[PDB]
Design a protein around this ligand. Structure first.
Ligand code: FAD
Ligand code: FAD
Lengths: 442, 442
């Protein structure tokens, strides 16, 4: 319904917040409303000593409903995966929006305190636009608009409904855990309640002192955990790498992928015949699954209409933003292997100018071609669908920056579009080396 | 045992941490060990979405054992009373240690994020000196030293014991809630599980939207809550002031003290015959009780030996620091109505020079006189025992600063002693006005 006036935003985290600012800066919408289940904005940057009550083991269903921790004396809490001693893996010269910088004397890879404070400051002017402690239950096109059903968080809230011209989903993709279904893991897990964990549960390393641990995974998250646990867990720390690894020291023993979990002997069978025993904790650092837990959108199975299948990615989203069949439904924040704030802002700026009619999306056929060419380059590896590892992210954010400049008419105040010059791209290229040196590792 | 070499510190919060630095700066002790039940230092500045599991209602026993939240997947969590949107009520020009300042561009009354980050930085060099996730169970003089019994926090830790020459208690006094035993409060509370709260449980104001609330108390904490709840709770907000109050608007109705709680009609009887009904939440902002939960010290009841009686204060502590009968037992952080970090540091510097023999405490008789004169000035109001409201705190911190200068010999590196000049004292005198104007209130 082209002339958009009432927009709904699902999520008040970094993505939803920059989406609101970009949208409001268009001066063309009469209503920009944000919905957030948490009592406060900032998404995951809301550190919680509280852990999830029940970790699905295994977890392969991207529809899984996030169950908050409730009590009679508190507001429902939605645990965040951030741990206590966490520090960014993204430099201050790159992370964060281009129109709000970090106070001087900030560490290059600061503690989450700094980023949580960052979000707080960024979100403040938007509090009157957000409906806090409110869970969006479903989203569907009814008649000529989108009907978003939502129940206020808090025991006894009544289910409510409101129509919108457009809807922007910024619900994040690090909530529903991904733990591959191995042989005998379910049983092994239920046998000893805290024996199997997922990165989303980690908080304080002191829990693992003296314990013999097995970290499964080889991505950044798993390597971080191996380092964090090195000074407390019993030596050596075991790590399961799909293809195995080269590190076999006294403190780190990389081993190949897992074959089976023997519940009766509690032995862990690794490919190649190697067997592990007396493992106090097994920690799955195998990431998450994308999720669109809204019945009206989840039922869509059709190749041309579906959004979610296995949770490896969100399908049918041109440029990772607009739902091809109906571009009044868009997503911001889907990007993988990027610098979240700048990339989400890049998408927001573009999204804003497209929904206010100051920019035109190419034909539906060409959008589908973009998708076709992308799928082909993935070679069956759909979980790389949204991945924009450098230089893809740089090219991408600069591509959106140049499409925005073409917006018309030119507003007196133009919501900024980030752009990565030669100096920025360089830092992004050696980002992990800059990080490694900063923390003295690798 | 004068020549002190091995010192134990109970608590790794602001008080315990500055105590460690001061102690280690004396270069006279062979062992300075800190004990902390939490997995990390910083005391209350460890924000926790987690609330206490069972709020005693009423609460009048200062011996009450703090029960952490346990689970099989996490380290035991000791909930802190800090709420989500909290900002200091102490200016950056005054709070914080004199040898570590706030980064530039910090708000004068910053968010807890800033202070939590502050503590993190301050505590880092002390991590190797702290025994984390370890609860001290008891403290007693055995033979010629102090035997501190402690059990590692974490299911299945074995009870351990270690002897020390001196022990410094910095366990804080904002844990054990104080809720006066009124007529029919226990029953009224147990009838509807979340009907009665204490400030230590507050976290997110959105919980109280639409609810009719009664804040009981008139101190700073209660006024803060009244303001925080004004934009969400049903109007008006009720506040119970011991002597009643002058504000009776549409949003705030101050009423006199509570007489009885009628459990069958759930009506709240206020002195003067006024009666309240349909009160969804009653929130006690009546502070805390001091606590010395160590059997060997709690059993002491004697006028000349006792430490705790009703929890209104810690008795027999000269200058609020040294246990008169045995000055090898000291307390830091007991001060009330002060600026915590500077005041605790002031005491630490003094404590350090007294335990290393570079300063001499006056006779036992004179110490007891100091106490006698203090008790007399309190006029039965023992809960004002440690209160050093300006200008007492200024005079006090400057008094300790001048006694420290007299230490001998002069060390190459002297642990700083804070001093409040004319400029500092002025800010401390109008502290609440400076705060009121900063937040635009009063
Ligand atoms: C362990 C960890 C470490 C990280 N470290 C970094 C780092 O160093 N640097 C970096 O750049 N990024 C880091 N990230 C990435 C992080 O995702 C981003 O910084 C940031 O979270 C971007 O968030 P967003 O708004 O897209 O999503 P964030 O209930 O995920 O999320 C969304 C918000 O929408 C809400 N929401 C979702 N669905 C609903 C619904 N149906 N109803 C109501 N509310 C809903 C959520 O509860 C939340 O408040 C890390 C993340 C993790 C988990
Ligand atoms: C709601 C609130 C707001 C505040 N706002 C401010 C403010 O704006 N400015 C300000 O200056 N102050 C403020 N304060 C005051 C605050 O007390 C101080 O900033 C700071 O906490 C000083 O702490 P400490 O080390 O003396 O105690 P903090 O388990 O209290 O405490 C002690 C530490 O010792 C540990 N411990 C105690 N007993 C044991 C044991 N037996 N075994 C093991 N560990 C033990 C504790 O668990 C903790 O980690 C506020 C406090 C509250 C509760």
């Amino acid at each position: 319904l082209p002339t958009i006036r009432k927009i709904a935003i699902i999520g008040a985290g970094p993505s939803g917040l920059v989406t609101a600012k970009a949208l409001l800066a268009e001066k063309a919408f009469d209503q920009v409303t944000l919905f957030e289940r948490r009592g406060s904005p900032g998404g995951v940057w809301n550190y919680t000593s509280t852990l999830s009550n029940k970790l699905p083991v295994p977890s392969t269903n991207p529809i899984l409903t996030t169950e908050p921790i409730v009590g009679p004396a508190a507001l429902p809490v939605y645990p965040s995966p951030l741990y206590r001693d966490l520090q960014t893996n993204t430099p201050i010269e790159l992370m964060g929006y281009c129109d709000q910088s970090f106070k001087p004397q900030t560490l290059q890879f600061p503690h989450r305190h700094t980023i949580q404070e960052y979000q707080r400051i960024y979100a403040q002017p938007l509090l009157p636009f957000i409906k806090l402690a409110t869970d969006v239950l479903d989203i569907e096109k009814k008649d000529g608009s989108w009907v978003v059903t939502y129940k206020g968080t808090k025991a006894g809230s009544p289910i409510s409904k409101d129509i919108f011209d457009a809807v922007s989903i910024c619900n994040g993709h690090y909530e529903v855990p991904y733990i591959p279904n191995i042989k005998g893991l379910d049983e092994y897990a239920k046998a000893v309640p805290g024996s199997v964990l997922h990165s989303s549960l980690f908080r304080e390393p002191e829990l693992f002192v003296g314990e013999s641990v097995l970290v499964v995974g080889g991505a950044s998250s798993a390597n971080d955990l191996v380092r964090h646990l090195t000074p407390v867990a019993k030596h050596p720390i075991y790590q399961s790498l799909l293809g195995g690894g080269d590190i076999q020291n006294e403190s780190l023993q990389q081993v190949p992928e897992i074959t089976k979990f023997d519940p009766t002997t509690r032995e862990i069978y690794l490919k190649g015949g190697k067997v592990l025993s007396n493992i106090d904790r097994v920690i799955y650092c195998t990431g998450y699954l994308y999720s669109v837990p809204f019945p009206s959108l989840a039922k869509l199975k059709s190749p041309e209409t579906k959004l979610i299948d296995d949770g490896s990615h969100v399908h049918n989203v041109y440029q990772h933003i607009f739902y091809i069949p109906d571009p009044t439904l868009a997503f911001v924040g889907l990007a993988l292997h990027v610098v979240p704030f700048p990339t989400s802002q890049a998408q927001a700026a573009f999204l804003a100018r497209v929904w206010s009619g100051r920019l035109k999306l190419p034909s539906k056929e060409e959008q589908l071609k973009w998708q076709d060419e992308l799928m082909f380059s993935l070679s069956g590896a759909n979980n790389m669908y949204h991945s924009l590892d450098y230089p893809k992210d740089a090219t991408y954010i600069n591509k959106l920056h140049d499409w925005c400049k073409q917006a018309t008419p030119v507003l007196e105040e133009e919501f900024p579009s980030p752009y990565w010059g030669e100096k920025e791209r360089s830092i992004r290229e050696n980002m992990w080396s800059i990080r490694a040196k900063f923390f003295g590792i690798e």
